From a paper:
pmcRibonucleotide reductases (RNRs) are essential enzymes in DNA biosynthesis and repair. They convert all four ribonucleotides ([name], UDP, ADP, and GDP) into the corresponding deoxyribonucleotides.
Our overall structure is consistent with the asymmetry observed in the prior cryo-EM structure: β2 is primarily contacting α and not α′. As expected, we find two ATP molecules bound in the allosteric activity sites in the N-terminal cone domain of α. Despite the presence of these two ATP molecules, there are no substantial changes in the cone domain’s interactions with β compared to the α2β2 structure without ATP. Instead of a polar residue in direct contact with Y356β, water molecules are positioned to contact Y356β, supporting the proposal that water molecules are the direct proton donors/acceptors of Y356β and thus play a direct role in PCET, consistent with electron nuclear double resonance (ENDOR) and electron paramagnetic resonance (EPR) spectroscopies and DFT studies. With our improved resolution, we can identify that there are two water channels, which we will refer to as pink and yellow channels, that connect bulk solvent with Y356β. Notably, in this midturnover structure, we observe that the E623α side chain has flipped away from Y731α, and a water molecule (Water1014 in Chain B) has taken the place of glutamate’s carboxylate.
Author numbering:
A (entry chain C): 1 to 375
B (entry chain B): 2 to 745
C (entry chain A): 128 to 381
D (entry chain D): 1 to 339, 360 to 373
Write the structure that this text describes.
């Protein structure tokens, strides 16, 4: 049975990441894996709110758009809103009752909070650019393409939650529920957990980035720059989320946490693959749905499909998977100006700056060293 | 082919023809190296559909060329530029060859695009001669960012229909002809030609108001407006009206609002009680954001207040993203004013006492005028138990200020004592109490009681810059400065003033700000860097030459055309030179002797005077440097191929002379820290009449804990104070966000 | 003064009610706002208001007029606003209330309106602004020299003017803004007060008044379409919207 | 069965607070209860990090303290660390699979994140005031005087989670698992959720404020100033969380959200009161354990017990419970310086005028 606080004094530097003793005391002075500590620190320093970006010009630029471009922008915003609404609640339910180290638990909670901020920001953009947002938010759960591009994540989450509840409630073995035989296997639970993590990786690493490219193409045409700043701030945290999922998957494949997980993942060099191929195909369908009434300068169906294949290859190489597409280059190199902020110098008196950290100061002041200072 | 059909500009429909696109690309590719037309065609043809407009084809090829700008093939920066030129000409005259200058001027004046006076002050023959001066081939020397800024910001255009009316050479020649319109007919055209050759060849950089409004019938080109707000409802209303009137006319605003009494302060002896400065700050912010800057960009303003203000803890956090609408004003920048006393309280670990400015008579005036009186009054009032005050820890206040400056990057510092002791103006008569939006302008101001009150004084500064990357010798600054000064001075007699107080200030002081651009390129060409301190002597010599030649030009202009009306209020009238009131600590880091005869200049200034109160001020040149493809101001470039982002585009800018000088450049995030840059800034401030837009840059990955230490921030602040740095501009931080998507 | 003293009837003080007396103490009778002690009674307040109002009257009929007005007011037959009762007979001369300010389609007019709003809210006076003449978003300025960013930024400026002297940012500032129904931005102005929008497109602390006439009502009745114009693009339509209905119909049809 | 994304486009403005259709999309432009949106906005407007507070002098101040004051400080820190280590994860696990309105879901997520920030701050303080933070963290679990409270607090969460799992797995009714009969009832699960929410309210309303008083009493002595600076922000966030859970309990009790939870609240009038008085007694016994081998200049057993009684009276009145102690003013005033339209139009208007 799951317990919020476990009365056994375990050593948390020797516990597995998942399927161990549930965490009791939240400590941050020592981590089994420091990568999650760094991710939490970076996410905290990356704090932001949509209210800090002036979006007055975004209304004017949106109302002057042709119908087809408005359709593209609003469809990407609606999909992102729904998926980040899902991503706000899903880690806390699927992953929290399975995590057995404090660092991963805190990272999952911080990641969920970041997704709530992202959903608020998408809603903020929609409220700003649309004079009646009720007509837009109501066409989200009923949109056919949005549903077709979203079930392949909630399904895996639901399966993981279902058999996690079964495991926490019955234990390993064969049991009889209402006369039906239910088998609870920790191997199957580990397999579902790996599959769900691989689905979340695919989502946050490919689908959200396709939507990001769609939103950034408008800013490349000197249109809707404040929404672009908001989306760039979102992508800044999305990089951290995909890095965290990638590390979670790679630590379960090398066997450094559980020797069984390595062979379980080896039994998934087709399933995990098939899932990524299906996600790429779903993105191709989404790209066809976006550019149905027309295309836009710098972005059409062919370019977005090429980018889908490129990013799928790039993010599948990072999790030890074969490349399902031709090894090519980036068809839209300008996206690199929206995800790498090292050489980006924005005009601060015209547009907002997206390169600020919150509370990244050591705060230690020694008055003795400052006293010996001649002004 | 694919049997595609395009929509022509005249509304007709034609068949696709790739040969025409290839011909245009080849036209734009003349004389370029490591540029392939095939790649542009490959990235452009995939986006062509049925019924595509030819204008969209041009935009597609321009964008495809611009996306190829990189360190391996920097020459694309020209191919994406000429293409963008090709489109502008077709958008301006319906063809490539521009018309005759006189016909263009007449046609533009008819429809009201240009000022009528151009057709009255110049005859047809003079227009033909200026047309002879013109060389449109110089349009091929622009970079992609330069052309994008010209198209989106500077070229005369309809802001509603998007139609462009002029090219860049017409812009330059008409600015030159319109500045020197009132000059004697014998030497007028020679001055016009010399100024046009200076600007078109990128020797002198002009700011946005001048580059976008000199030929226009709206005649206001002061880039910087300084307004002082008084502790009065009438003063607040007048400040709001002046802000609205001047933002709409191509001007940024620096509001000194440190005189407004604190929250809870009695009004009329107790009949009413003050509700705080926050609602008035919100009023100022809405005044700034109501209009645009002449239909070019959004308005911006900076608020100034002393550190010892009773509400300083509330004002410090006004910018961060961690509040609500009732306690945050996030769309205006802020400047904290500090003197030696606060720094000493921080050093000794004592407490800082905050008073309402209305409750301490004389403290606010002595804050800027003289510091002995300020210390006496501050000590007296700290021991007075009948005065409303609040005591805070100096380390706590400074920590809060630096926390907010790091988190928002836009909490600027002004050392008021340095702004007055090392000032061209006399603190007793004309003290400096504030700065401009970008913290480079330091001019006297007087509060206004009405938008038409004549007792007030609004400070106006018109700017220009020297391209240090276009001068081969410092002696070349002799002529250019003259031109610059002359042009700017003529602008002062050409401009219109919506607020009479601004006219009073501009005609009384005639202040100009001439800075520099391409300083990083200059250092790299001389084989020096910011960090190691090798540039100290070179910076000393360069800025000594700049200040000497600006002063000489102003002195000649004064002895030819009369001295400045309020020249008696400046320290120059008493023989005091910038080489006299500089901070002595600068002697420990620079050993370079003066090369020019400053004694003869001092005697000449005493005898005749200066036409202008101020001449030097280092602006950031965020937008104006892009025209000449120059590093902005004195800031090192962030990358070899940097990205300039604005509402007018995301643009890839290559550092000048990247092929032969990439190893000699020092990029911003390759700097050990801030010591060398601050030393260079202090050496500059030794000679500059006004402040310098000095940035502090911190990368938290350079420290063991991954966090910038508060000790380092305070040490850098104290170091900037020690070397005489008047003001600190943006604090830039390396967030470390990197999700690289390069080829596999 | 002796004649006024014999005109005074202090028995009328026993005609008030408890809420009446509480309001009288709170805002009517002169008092010290620190020590909280009062100095005058209701009858003195009424008689002195009557005397001060009729001070510049001929001395043949001044006393009878003062007596009649005091009898009318003390009997609760004529009621006058709280600022009159708190200011008249006192050294102040600010007898505030509500002010109607019209704003033209000019930057000078906008600045003057904002200054007047600031000067009148500090006296705790309600504001009625007519900002319906401001041209719509996208209208040319100086023949295309600038792009108009709409009425919303100026409405926000007016709102901050109203709240400039308000405690906590937004507390006792009250204003009502008027615009015609046929304004080109009417769809974006009607939703200025609901929470479905962001701060950048919402002005929630000011009330709004939509101006309608016969043509809008008859188009609603017939189920036709209402056409919205920028007031600067239709010469004479804004003036005819109030003055001449037949002329407005002719101009609207044209 | 719980689903992360429910495909039915329900109307979230009429859904119950709990036990309705699981939330699918988050709505910020409209809320059934705006109080949670205001709470989320306030929490985001109070965002802080432990690294913004200087705690350098705290080590020197702690090293100069007497043994019995050091004991009090470290026991208070251990109690706070355990409480917020529980409160970090517990709302995200117990409440998330039960919420059916987006605003409450977002508030719960933000609240859990803020509790994680509190835990990080406690770790920061412990690491900055003690030579090795192990002798405290590994002592938290085994400390006899804290584990009883740990069980008493986590039991409600665990029972709620277990019943929620059976409800989502089997649904309402009588089922057979491994030959034993399990009765899953929505009334029983509603009672469990109400009891858990009351336990959370008692935790963040009473248990944390005693420790706040102990931490602030050192501040009134000009000792451990950075710790006090951190605890001030923690107390602000606590007040926010307490307001949120108080609103949750009040809206469940009023019956305006669920016509069945009113009965459950009425039948908890004895169990909820017992839980609150048990929490108050536990805090009094913790105060006893704190000052055993000595006492502090401004804090002792007596006045701290009076403060516990005062704070629990005030926080028990707020959720409609009978006061269990005599009315008494705040014994430590210094702590107050540290804390619906149908849119249809016919063609009958043509014949109006
Ligand atoms: N028939 C065509 N097929 C393909 N591209 C064309 C064709 N005609 C013009 N273009 C391209 O369209 C771009 C823009 O051309 P341009 O600005 O001259 O407008 P236009 O439609 O050609 O009208 P016009 O030249 O008569 O003024 C050019 O780069 C040009 O190469
Ligand atoms: N001599 C030139 N050098 C550089 N660019 C040119 C030149 N002539 C035209 N251009 C540019 O190339 C584009 C098209 O030129 P042009 O109108 O002559 O041919 P086109 O429009 O492509 O085909 P068509 O002759 O059918 O109109 C325009 O943007 C135009 O400004
Ligand atoms: N009613 C008000 N509420 C809040 N602030 C006000 C009010 N009236 C004026 N202020 C502000 C405006 C100024 O910043 C400051 C000073 O008041 P002011 O405009 O000078 O009128 P005043 O001259 O009659 O009072 P004083 O003699 O005290 O200056 O107080
Ligand atoms: N720079 C600006 N940005 C946004 N709006 C502006 C700007 N300048 C003026 N406006 C608004 C204010 C008025 O509502 C409207 C007209 O302004 P106005 O002050 O009368 O200028 P104007 O007379 O020089 O040009 P016009 O004749 O077109 O009005 O446009
Ligand atoms: N006087 C100023 O400091 C402020 C003002 N300004 C600059 C940039 C923006 N977006 N708005 C403004 O109001 O101009 C000068 C600053 O000088 P520069 O920034 O260097 O001039 P320029 O690059 O715009 O041409
Ligand atoms: Mg006054
Ligand atoms: Mg006008």
């Amino acid at each position: 049975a799951y317990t919020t606080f476990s009365q056994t004094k375990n050593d948390q530097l020797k516990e597995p990441m998942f399927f161990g003793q549930p965490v009791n005391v939240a400590r941050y002075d020592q981590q089994k894996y420091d990568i999650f500590e760094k991710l939490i620190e970076k996410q905290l320093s990356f704090f932001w709110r949509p209210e800090e970006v002036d979006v007055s010009r975004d209304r004017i630029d949106y109302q002057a758009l042709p119908e087809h471009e408005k359709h593209i922008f609003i469809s990407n915003l609606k999909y992102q809103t729904l998926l980040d609404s899902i991503q706000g609640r899903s880690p806390n339910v699927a992953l929290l009752p399975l995590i057995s180290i404090p660092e991963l638990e805190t990272w999952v909670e911080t990641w969920a909070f970041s997704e709530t901020i992202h959903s608020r920001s998408y809603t903020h953009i929609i409220r700003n650019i649309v004079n009646d947002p009720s007509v837009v938010f109501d066409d989200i759960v009923t949109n056919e393409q949005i549903q077709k591009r979203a079930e392949g994540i909630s399904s895996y989450y639901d399966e993981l939650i279902e058999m996690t509840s079964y495991w926490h409630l019955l234990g390993e073995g064969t049991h009889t529920v209402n006369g039906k035989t239910v088998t609870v296997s920790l191997r199957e639970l580990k397999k579902k957990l790996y599959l769900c993590l691989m689905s979340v990786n695919a989502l946050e690493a490919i689908r959200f980035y396709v939507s990001f490219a769609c939103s950034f193409a408008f800013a490349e045409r000197e249109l809707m720059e404040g929404n672009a700043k908001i989306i760039r701030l979102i992508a800044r945290d999305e990089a951290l989320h995909l890095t965290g999922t990638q590390h979670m998957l790679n630590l379960l494949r090398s066997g450094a946490d559980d020797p069984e997980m390595a062979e379980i993942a080896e039994e998934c060099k087709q399933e995990c693959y098939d899932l990524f191929v299906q996600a790429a195909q779903q993105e191709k369908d989404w790209a066809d749905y976006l550019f149905r009434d027309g295309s836009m300068i710098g972005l059409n169906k062919d370019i977005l499909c090429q980018y889908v294949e490129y990013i799928t290859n790039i993010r599948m190489q990072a999790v030890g998977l074969d490349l399902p597409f031709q090894t090519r280059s980036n068809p839209i190199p300008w996206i690199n100006t929206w995800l790498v902020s090292d050489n980006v110098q924005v005009a601060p008196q015209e547009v907002e700056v997206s390169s600020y950290l919150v509370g990244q100061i050591d705060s230690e002041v020694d008055t003795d060293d400052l006293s010996n200072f001649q002004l | 082919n694919q049997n595609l059909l395009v929509t022509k500009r005249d509304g007709s429909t034609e068949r696709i023809n790739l040969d025409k696109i290839h011909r245009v690309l080849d036209w734009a590719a003349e004389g370029l190296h490591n540029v392939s037309i095939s790649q542009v065609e490959l990235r452009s043809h995939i986006q062509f559909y049925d019924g595509i407009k030819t204008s969209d084809i041009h935009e597609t090829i321009i964008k495809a060329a611009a996306d190829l700008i990189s360190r391996d093939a920097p020459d694309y920066q020209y191919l994406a530029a000429r293409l963008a030129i090709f489109h502008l000409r077709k958008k301006a005259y319906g063809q490539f060859e521009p018309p005759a200058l006189y016909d263009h001027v007449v046609k533009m004046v008819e429809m009201g695009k240009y000022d009528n006076h151009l057709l009255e002050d110049y005859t047809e023959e003079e227009f033909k001669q200026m047309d002879t001066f013109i060389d449109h081939d110089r349009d091929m020397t622009f970079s992609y960012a330069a052309v994008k800024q010209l198209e989106g910001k500077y070229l005369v255009q309809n802001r509603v229909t998007g139609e462009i009316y002029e090219s860049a050479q017409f812009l330059y020649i008409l600015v030159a002809a319109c500045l020197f319109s009132n000059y004697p007919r014998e030497t007028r055209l020679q001055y016009v030609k010399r100024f046009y050759d200076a600007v078109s060849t990128f020797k002198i950089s002009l700011p946005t108001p001048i580059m976008s409004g000199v030929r226009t019938p709206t005649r206001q080109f002061s880039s910087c407006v300084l307004i002082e707000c008084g502790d009065s409802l009438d003063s607040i209303n007048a400040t709001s009206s002046a802000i609205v009137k001047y933002v709409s006319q191509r001007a940024g605003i620096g509001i000194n609002a440190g005189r407004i009494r604190a929250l809870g302060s009695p009004i009329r002896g107790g009949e009413a009680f003050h509700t705080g400065c926050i609602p008035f700050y919100k009023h100022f912010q809405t005044a700034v954001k109501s209009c645009s800057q002449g239909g070019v960009r959004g308005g911006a303003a900076t608020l100034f207040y002393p550190m010892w203000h009773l509400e300083v803890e509330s004002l410090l956090v006004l910018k961060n993203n961690r509040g609500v609408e009732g306690n945050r004003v996030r769309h205006m920048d802020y400047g904290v004013q500090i003197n030696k006393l606060m720094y000493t309280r921080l050093l000794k670990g004592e407490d800082i006492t905050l008073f309402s400015p209305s409750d301490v008579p004389g403290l606010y005036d002595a804050f800027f005028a003289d510091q002995e009186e300020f210390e006496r009054l501050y000590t007296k009032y700290e021991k007075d138990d009948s005065i409303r005050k609040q005591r805070v820890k100096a380390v706590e206040l400074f920590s809060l200020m630096m926390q907010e400056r790091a988190s928002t990057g836009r909490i600027y510092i002004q050392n008021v004592d340095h702004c007055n002791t090392h000032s061209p103006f006399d603190p007793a008569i004309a003290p400096v109490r504030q700065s401009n939006l970008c913290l480079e302008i330091a001019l006297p101001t007087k509060p206004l009681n009405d938008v038409n009150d004549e007792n007030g004084e609004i400070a106006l500064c018109t700017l220009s810059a020297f391209n240090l990357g276009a001068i081969n010798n410092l002696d070349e600054l002799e002529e250019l400065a003259i031109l610059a000064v002359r042009a700017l001075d003529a602008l002062l007699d050409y401009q219109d003033y919506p607020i009479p107080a601004a006219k009073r200030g501009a005609m009384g002081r005639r202040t100009l700000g001439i800075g520099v651009i391409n300083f990083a390129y200059y250092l790299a060409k001389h084989g020096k860097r910011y960090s190691d301190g090798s540039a100290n002597n070179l910076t000393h010599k360069t800025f000594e030459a700049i200040q000497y030649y600006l002063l000489k030009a102003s002195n000649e202009l004064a002895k030819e055309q009369g001295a400045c009306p309020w020249f008696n209020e400046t320290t120059y009238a008493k023989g005091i030179l910038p080489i006299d009131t500089y901070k002595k600590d600068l002697d420990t880091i620079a050993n370079e002797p003066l090369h020019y005869d400053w004694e003869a200049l001092r005697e000449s200034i005493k005898t005749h005077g200066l036409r202008n109160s101020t001449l030097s001020a280092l602006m950031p040149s965020e937008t104006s440097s892009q025209i000449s493809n120059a590093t902005n101001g004195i800031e090192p470039p962030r990358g070899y191929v940097s990205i300039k982002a604005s509402k007018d585009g995301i643009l890839r800018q290559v550092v000048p002379d990247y092929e032969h000088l990439h190893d000699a450049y020092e990029l911003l995030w390759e700097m050990p820290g801030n010591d060398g840059y601050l030393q260079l800034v202090g050496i500059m401030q030794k000679f500059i009449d006004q402040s310098i837009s000095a940035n502090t840059n911190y990368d938290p990955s350079r420290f063991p804990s991954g966090k910038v230490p508060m000790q380092q921030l305070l040490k850098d602040l104290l170091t900037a104070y020690k070397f005489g740095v008047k003001t600190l501009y943006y604090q830039n931080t390396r967030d470390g966000a990197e999700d690289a998507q390069d080829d596999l």
